[PDB]
Amino acid sequence: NEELRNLLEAQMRNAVEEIATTLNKKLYDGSGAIADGGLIGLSIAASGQD
């Protein structure tokens, strides 16, 4: 295969797309902790907890 041929360039675009899909998953489950990436998210932005 052509994508699996160049092993750095394949994993380069494969990690950016994992950053992108773990980030909106935290836009609904954000809690501000370091393990949650620092995002705040809609779990407490769409409810009243200060």
Binding site: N1, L4, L7, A10, Q11, N14
Partner: protein
């Protein structure tokens, strides 16, 4: 977890080595002839006089 640990393929190369000995020396110098008959007959002469 390697991303091409199961897609890499095993390909040989044009390096066939002739190992068996199948020679023919003594057949190679007997001066072959095409005899299309049933049996070869010639004459052997002994003594007697």
């Amino acid at each position: 977890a390697k991303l091409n640990l199961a897609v890499l393929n095993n390909v040989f190369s044009e390096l066939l080595t002739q190992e068996i000995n199948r020679s023919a020396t003594f057949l190679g110098l007997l001066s072959k002839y095409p005899e299309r008959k049933s049996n070869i007959q010639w004459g052997v002469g002994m003594g007697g006089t």
